[PDB]
Design an enzyme around this catalytic site. Structure first.
Site, PDB file in Angstrom:
ATOM      1  N   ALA A 274      47.407  45.464  44.263  1.00  0.00           N
ATOM      2  CA  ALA A 274      48.548  46.115  44.899  1.00  0.00           C
ATOM      3  C   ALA A 274      48.177  47.494  45.433  1.00  0.00           C
ATOM      4  CB  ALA A 274      49.722  46.205  43.923  1.00  0.00           C
TER       5      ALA A 274
ATOM      6  N   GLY B 191      49.833  44.079  36.932  1.00  0.00           N
ATOM      7  CA  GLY B 191      48.519  43.501  36.774  1.00  0.00           C
ATOM      8  C   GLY B 191      47.676  44.175  35.680  1.00  0.00           C
TER       9      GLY B 191
ATOM     10  N   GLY C 165      45.689  47.235  37.579  1.00  0.00           N
ATOM     11  CA  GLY C 165      46.639  48.272  37.951  1.00  0.00           C
ATOM     12  C   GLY C 165      47.255  48.972  36.760  1.00  0.00           C
TER      13      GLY C 165
ATOM     14  N   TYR D  47      53.776  40.121  50.980  1.00  0.00           N
ATOM     15  CA  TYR D  47      53.219  41.430  50.685  1.00  0.00           C
ATOM     16  C   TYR D  47      52.964  42.241  51.960  1.00  0.00           C
ATOM     17  CZ  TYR D  47      52.185  40.050  45.794  1.00  0.00           C
ATOM     18  OH  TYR D  47      52.218  39.600  44.476  1.00  0.00           O
TER      19      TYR D  47
ATOM     20  N   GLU E 240      53.325  71.777  44.598  1.00  0.00           N
ATOM     21  CA  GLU E 240      54.688  71.992  45.068  1.00  0.00           C
ATOM     22  C   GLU E 240      55.574  70.784  44.802  1.00  0.00           C
ATOM     23  OE1 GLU E 240      54.463  73.787  49.017  1.00  0.00           O
ATOM     24  OE2 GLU E 240      56.640  73.464  49.144  1.00  0.00           O
TER      25      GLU E 240
END
Ligand SMILES: CC[C@]1(O)C[C@@H]2CN(CCc3c([nH]c4cc(Br)ccc34)[C@@](C(=O)OC)(c3cc4c(cc3OC)N(C)[C@H]3[C@@](O)(C(=O)OC)[C@H](OC(C)=O)[C@]5(CC)C=CCN6CC[C@]43[C@@H]65)C2)C1
Ligand SMILES: Nc1nc2c(ncn2[C@@H]2O[C@H](COP(=O)(O)OP(=O)(O)OP(=O)(O)O)[C@@H](O)[C@H]2O)c(=O)[nH]1
Ligand SMILES: Nc1nc2c(ncn2[C@@H]2O[C@H](COP(=O)(O)OP(=O)(O)O)[C@@H](O)[C@H]2O)c(=O)[nH]1
Ligand SMILES: [Ca+2]
Ligand SMILES: [Mg+2]
EC number: 3.6.5.-
Lengths: 439, 54, 428, 331
Positions: free
Chosen positions: A12, A143, A146, A224, A254
């Site tokens: 992904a 996953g 991931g 996807y 920031e």
């Protein structure tokens, strides 16, 4: 000028990363071969866009990107694909076999095996930076790579760059496209272990993106590619401020300062508009009022949830295209009286506003229609905890029966790490509640 | 209501608008982590091979 | 390249094995002589999962053929695709096993096992990234059953960290009349519980019911049964042999299907059911696919799914059809029969679609369920076992090969536990 | 077919609602933690709203409006009206009130408006001398509210006794505000007590505490056909013109006020909810609002009809099967 390095982890992260650099390249006028007629600083420069691209003697502008998947299939498409010249091979790092949708297998078993090499190829990019500020880390929750590797990489990054910032773009698991029943395990596991090491996490619920693709792009069963083009739109909006001239959100610190007063509550909601089908026979264009109002509609959020039932701690409005402040403030006046926008007492009710005059770049052939103005809102509302309550419930249902747990233990992970992660999330749900108790 | 810190470019503008005012683990422990896990899976296997050799 | 080593052992295991190869060989465009002649790069994209690459653009099944007697291997070698196999990969004895597990596991089978193993190595040796093993065999005989599970125990000793997958044909009194089959099956299930990662329970009782009742085959043959077994085997391996997102290797399938290490016995299901030679006139619609592949009449295991609950489920659609419609129907199924899916595994039905349909059909669906209702199979076998074992009937055929009663008491015990484990979870 | 779970195993009202649904043959009832429902008859507190509308394939509907506690808590209701310009001091129908804390509150601001003839009210305590009220809250440890006791309340005859009026309102998923045509007066069994007020029973019309000291109405329950007849013969008017008109207005104003906070028009799940509105009718035929209860129970005589109306207005509107009892309040 200070550089940001992007790290894409898992299928992904890699596929999303690809859509982002495809988009990134259009916006800055860089061609599939790194060449950029716009740049007359041939060989270099300290321009705003160089925070994401370094420059090659021959004129090649090269993403400061690093891809890593515990298996070669997906990144192999980047090596061979349409932007092959853009990246140097050393930044497309593949293993051999993957984490099997198993957090433990990606953190413990195959982590060790590839961590040092990834940290190496990464330090190879920092060395080439005059004033590195930190990392943009793209990945899925569900996953094995991931979730598991990313939490491993995050801990090595904090040890090897304590000075720098770490932003996440995280993909939250949705049944409509998930490929594993254990995703809530991997999701809680990786959130608990990455939590203290991330400064700002932009959570994209695949479910939310999926329905925006059906409802507003008319995509009958989004793939996807649909999903990733829209996410690259939203991701581009959140980063525009680091690649272009501006005085708002100009470096990663920031983002935390404007968005994250509380370190653990560092998960700001993103809401984007307008999403219009390019196949739609003329659309009556939307005003600054209409797009800004649409920012307080759940159906445009990257996470379905109801910010009326929760407080705010911060709000950022990021405009692209034909916008001037008299319209922005005028729009806020109106909606301010119609909507329920309660901030927390220790925070002022207000909006930081950023306008880039260049309208959103459309990927030629994609599903999105070009629009004369667009807006991404980054608000930090306690309502996003809703997502943690759903994911925590799914985990509780499975773990109470130890369903699938033996797959994690079998890899060297102890059962109790499950309970320590879930307790972290339990406490995180309490934080969000404490801050949002008011009404 | 109050528009603060306006900042103009040739690319856009930036400003705040307020409607109402208010009121680390080291490389060491990590290695312990991974190594210890690998030795648990190393043991579990050894138990398996031992049962099969039986 | 995530390779899979195929092992077929014994009569049944070799006859459904050659058929599996015959069928996927066509699906992938490989002819008997082993050369690609197909019209889609999809057919070749993952051909490495089942075939080795040879010189001349030739593809050899990564298959090992094993039996303790020389027939079968003979007929296999003179079968349509007989010549595609590597000829050193035929490993066979002479004595046979006489439908006796002890002969397969302990005596005759011990003589020939090592030489099978060497070929397994030679194939594994060759592998870029070995997923694991897939074994076809019956549980009712001697070779597939006793030497097949011996082989599995050996292989796991050498490759403790690879996946072990079996298609295991369960014996049924409707199809065979050897009185000791419940012994051989109970001894095998004991091993399978311990040493496989996924087992497809291919139940001759269901294959018979389908062929005789449903397909109106009044004199069914093993050819008929094996027709249904080769469509199922094609079905449940689509995700490993073509490009895909869901269950695309053996470990990932195991992580989605197996919530507790011992409950790894799946119920396959296939629709539409067809007799060999059925020349199909229209394709099913996506809603017929779905009703049917969850129908009990379509299961390859003789169990009533409404008597248990699904722990997990994979669903594979093949042919050109509408993802939106497949998705709508799969959601409909679960929401209209939702008490049948354990709620403590959210979202336990996963759905894949393959554009390329099987031979003969425009539309097919393949079902893989991990239902607690599989306990009906093991109970059926256990009751036959007990009826004989409580009078130690026919035991001398085993004790004479070296075995001790104890070994039976234990197999009986491990399978009766298996059933109780399935019941505990269907009451949760 | 549709499915529903049942998660407040005490609701009288929704007991009859599931029985109605089952008995249609088109509605199955699931294990309460099975997430594949269309209807959640939901628990009373910490209903898991954030879990709703994430089940693809399912339209989902629940029988509470998240955030409608604003209207149904005695502390929040007060603060709702004071700080909400639509009501605020557009408000003639809610007695004076202040939120009070047993030591952002108005115990200071309270004493001010206090000194005038002052009778106020708070396991409930009403008096006329401040000290013993402000000291009563300081007793227990729950947030409390002090509102003017209506010293001069319409009394029924024959009896010289006080009463309150319960109105049931069902707000559906489109935000239609429905008013059941049958209301009820919960009367008092013994005559109101002019000077002096602390006996209770004759001051607290609240039902249960009346099932304990009673003669004129079956269970101290007067319905609207009788109370209208009395109003005619006794006062030369009607329920409609004298009470209901103000009631209908009061319900619409209260709910329209919070509609932007609780509407589900563009939300991934849909809400409906049954509300119990409690009114005082005073000497001058002026109507006052008292409490609004988010989990009302019904009157025995009326369960059948109301619960069938719930099913037809708020459940079959969204889940259609194979002369209204309600007045739609028109905004
Ligand atoms: C898939 C291939 C085949 O696997 C499946 C079978 C058996 N086989 C050989 C083929 C065969 C059959 N019959 C034969 C008779 C002889 Br002399 C020699 C060969 C056969 C079968 C046939 O008829 O078609 C070819 C055949 C055979 C049998 C059958 C149905 C059936 O076919 C509809 N019953 C379901 C079984 C039977 O026990 C019962 O009802 O109770 C369970 C039968 O008892 C009665 C009262 O019927 C019967 C019949 C002799 C009695 C002795 C032993 N039992 C074992 C099989 C069973 C048989 C096909 C393998
Ligand atoms: N939106 C979107 N989500 C994706 C994409 N690819 C994967 N995902 C999400 O990721 C989950 C599966 O794990 P992956 O992120 O793909 O992990 P991986 O990169 O394949 O690496 P492994 O852990 O070895 O599987 C799915 O449930 C998806 O929700 C993508 O291209 N777009
Ligand atoms: N479905 C099916 N089952 C078979 C076939 N051949 C044999 N069997 C089953 O296998 C059992 C016999 O096992 P057997 O081949 O003798 O085992 P082995 O001697 O160890 O090889 C019988 O009970 C049959 O039911 C076949 O072609 N198809
Ligand atoms: Ca430059
Ligand atoms: Mg992957």
């Amino acid at each position: 000028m200070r550089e940001c390095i992007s790290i894409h982890v898992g299928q992904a992260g890699v596929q999303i990363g690809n859509a982002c650099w495809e988009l990134y390249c259009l916006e800055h006028g860089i061609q599939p071969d790194g060449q950029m007629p716009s740049d007359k600083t041939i060989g270099g420069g300290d321009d705003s866009f160089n925070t994401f691209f370094s420059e090659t003697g021959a004129g090649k502008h090269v993403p400061r990107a690093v891809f890593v998947d515990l298996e070669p299939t997906v990144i192999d498409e980047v090596r061979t694909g349409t932007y092959r010249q853009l990246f140097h091979p050393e930044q497309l790092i593949t293993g051999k076999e993957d984490a099997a949708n198993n957090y433990a297998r990606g953190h413990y078993t195959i982590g060790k095996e590839i961590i040092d090499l990834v940290l190496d190829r990464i330090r190879k990019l920092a060395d080439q930076c005059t004033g590195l500020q930190g990392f943009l880390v793209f990945h899925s929750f569900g996953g094995g790579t991931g979730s598991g590797f990313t939490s491993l990489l995050m801990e090595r990054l904090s040890v090897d760059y304590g000075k720098k910032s770490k932003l996440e773009f995280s993909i939250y698991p949705a049944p409509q496209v998930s490929t594993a029943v254990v995703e809530p395990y991997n999701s809680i596991l990786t959130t608990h272990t990455t939590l203290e090491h991330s400064d700002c996490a932009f959570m994209v619920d695949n479910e939310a993106i999926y329905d925006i693709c059906r409802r507003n792009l008319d995509i009958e069963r989004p793939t996807y590619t649909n999903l990733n083009r829209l996410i690259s739109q939203i991701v581009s909006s959140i980063t525009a401020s680091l690649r272009f001239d501006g005085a708002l959100n100009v470096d990663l610190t920031e983002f935390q300062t404007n968005l994250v007063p509380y370190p653990r509550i560092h998960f700001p909601l993103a809401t984007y508009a307008p999403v219009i089908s390019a196949e739609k026979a003329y659309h009556e264009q939307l005003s600054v009022a209409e797009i800004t109002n649409a920012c307080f509609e759940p159906a445009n959020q990257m996470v379905k949830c109801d910010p009326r039932h929760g407080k705010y701690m911060a709000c950022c409005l990021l405009y692209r295209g034909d916008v001037v402040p008299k319209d922005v403030n005028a729009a806020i006046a109106t909606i301010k009286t119609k909507r329920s926008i309660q901030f927390v007492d220790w925070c002022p009710t207000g909006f930081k506003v950023g306008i880039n005059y260049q309208p959103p770049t459309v990927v030629p052939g994609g599903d999105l229609a070009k629009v004369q103005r667009a807006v991404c809102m980054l608000s930090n509302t306690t309502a996003i905890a809703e997502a943690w309550a759903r994911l925590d419930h799914k985990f509780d249902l499975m773990y109470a029966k130890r369903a699938f747990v033996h797959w994690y233990v079998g890899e060297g992970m102890e059962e109790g790490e499950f309970s320590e992660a879930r307790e972290d999330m339990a406490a995180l749900e309490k934080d969000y509640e404490e801050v949002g108790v008011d009404s | 209501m109050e528009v603060i810190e306006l900042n103009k470019c040739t690319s856009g503008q930036s400003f705040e608008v307020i409607l109402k005012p208010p009121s680390d683990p080291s490389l060491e422990e990590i290695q312990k982590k991974l190594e210890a896990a690998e030795e648990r899976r190393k043991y579990q296997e050894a138990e398996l091979l031992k049962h099969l050799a039986e | 390249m995530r390779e899979i080593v195929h092992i077929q052992a014994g009569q049944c295991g070799n006859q459904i094995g050659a058929k599996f190869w015959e069928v996927i060989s066509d699906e992938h465009g490989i002819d008997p002589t082993g050369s690609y002649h197909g019209d889609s790069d999809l057919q070749l994209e993952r051909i490495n999962v089942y075939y080795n690459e040879a010189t001349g653009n030739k593809y050899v099944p990564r298959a090992i053929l094993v039996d303790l007697e020389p027939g079968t291997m003979d007929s296999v070698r003179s079968g349509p695709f007989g010549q595609i196999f590597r000829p050193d990969n035929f490993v066979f004895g002479q004595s046979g096993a006489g439908n006796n597990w002890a002969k397969g596991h302990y005596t005759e089978g011990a003589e020939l096992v090592d030489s099978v193993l060497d070929v397994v190595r030679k194939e594994s040796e060759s592998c870029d990234c070995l997923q694991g093993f897939q074994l076809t065999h019956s549980l009712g005989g001697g070779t597939g059953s006793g030497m097949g599970t011996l082989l599995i125990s050996k292989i796991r000793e050498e490759y403790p960290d690879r996946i072990m997958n079996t298609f295991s044909v369960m014996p049924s009194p409707k199809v065979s009349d050897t009185v000791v089959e419940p012994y051989n099956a109970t001894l095998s299930v004991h091993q399978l519980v311990e040493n496989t990662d996924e087992t497809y329970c291919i139940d001759n009782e269901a294959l018979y019911d389908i062929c005789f009742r449903t397909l109106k085959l009044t004199t069914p043959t093993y050819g008929d049964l094996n027709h249904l077994v080769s469509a199922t085997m094609s079905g449940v391996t689509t995700c490993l042999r073509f490009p895909g997102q869901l269950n695309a290797d053996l470990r990932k399938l195991a992580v989605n299907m197996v919530p507790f290490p011992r409950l790894h016995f799946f119920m396959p299901g296939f629709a539409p059911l067809t007799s060999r030679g059925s020349q199909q006139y229209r394709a099913l619609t996506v809603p017929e696919l779905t009703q049917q592949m969850f129908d009990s009449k379509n299961m390859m295991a003789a169990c009533d799914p409404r008597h248990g609950r699904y722990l997990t489920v994979a669903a594979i659609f093949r042919g050109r059809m509408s993802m939106k419609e497949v998705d709508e129907q799969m959601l409909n199924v679960q929401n209209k029969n939702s008490s049948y899916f354990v709620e403590w595994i959210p979202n336990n039905v996963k759905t894949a679609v393959c554009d390329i349909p099987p031979r003969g059909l425009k539309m097919s669906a393949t079902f893989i369920g991990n239902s607690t209702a599989i306990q009906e199979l093991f109970k059926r076998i256990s009751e036959q076992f007990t009826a004989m074992f409580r009078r130690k009937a026919f035991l001398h055929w085993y004790t004479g090969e070296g075995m001790d009663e104890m070994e039976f008491t234990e197999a009986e015990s491990n399978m009766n536990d298996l059933v109780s484990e399935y019941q505990q979870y269907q009451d949760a | 077919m549709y499915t529903f779970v049942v998660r407040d195993e005490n609701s009288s009202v929704y007991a009859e609602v599931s029985r109605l649904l089952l008995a249609t043959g088109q509605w199955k009832r699931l294990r309460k933690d099975n997430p594949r429902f269309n209807l959640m008859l939901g628990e009373r507190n910490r209903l898991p709203f954030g879990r709703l509308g994430h089940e693809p394939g399912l339209v989902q509907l629940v029988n509470y409006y998240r955030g409608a506690d604003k209207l149904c808590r005695k502390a929040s209701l007060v603060k709702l009206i004071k700080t909400s310009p639509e009501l605020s001091e557009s408000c003639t129908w809610f007695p004076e009130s202040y939120v009070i804390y047993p030591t952002t509150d108005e115990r200071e601001v309270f004493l001010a408006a206090y000194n005038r003839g002052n009778v106020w009210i708070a396991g409930i305590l009403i008096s006329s001398e401040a000290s013993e009220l402000l000291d009563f809250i300081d007793e227990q440890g729950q947030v409390h509210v002090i509102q003017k006791y209506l010293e001069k309340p319409l009394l029924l005859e024959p009896g010289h006794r006080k009463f309150d009026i319960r109105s049931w309102v069902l707000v559906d998923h489109l935000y239609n505000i429905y008013l059941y045509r049958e209301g009820v007066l919960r009367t008092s069994s013994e005559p109101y007590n002019s000077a002096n007020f602390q006996d209770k029973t004759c001051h607290l019309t609240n039902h249960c505490i009346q099932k304990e000291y009673s003669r004129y109405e079956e269970g101290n329950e007067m319905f609207f056909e009788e109370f209208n007849q009395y109003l005619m013969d006794a006062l030369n008017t009607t329920l409609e013109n004298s009470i209901l008109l103000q009631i209908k207005h009061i319900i619409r104003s209260c709910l329209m006020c919070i509609e932007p906070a609780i509407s589900t028009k563009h939300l991934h799940y849909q809400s409906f909810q049954l509300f119990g509105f409690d009114f005082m009718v005073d000497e001058e035929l002026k109507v006052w609002l008292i409490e609004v209860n988010g989990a009302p129970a019904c009157a025995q005589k009326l369960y059948a009809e109301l619960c069938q109306g719930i099913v037809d207005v708020a459940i079959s509107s969204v889940f259609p099967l194979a002369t209204s009892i309600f007045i739609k309040l028109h905004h």
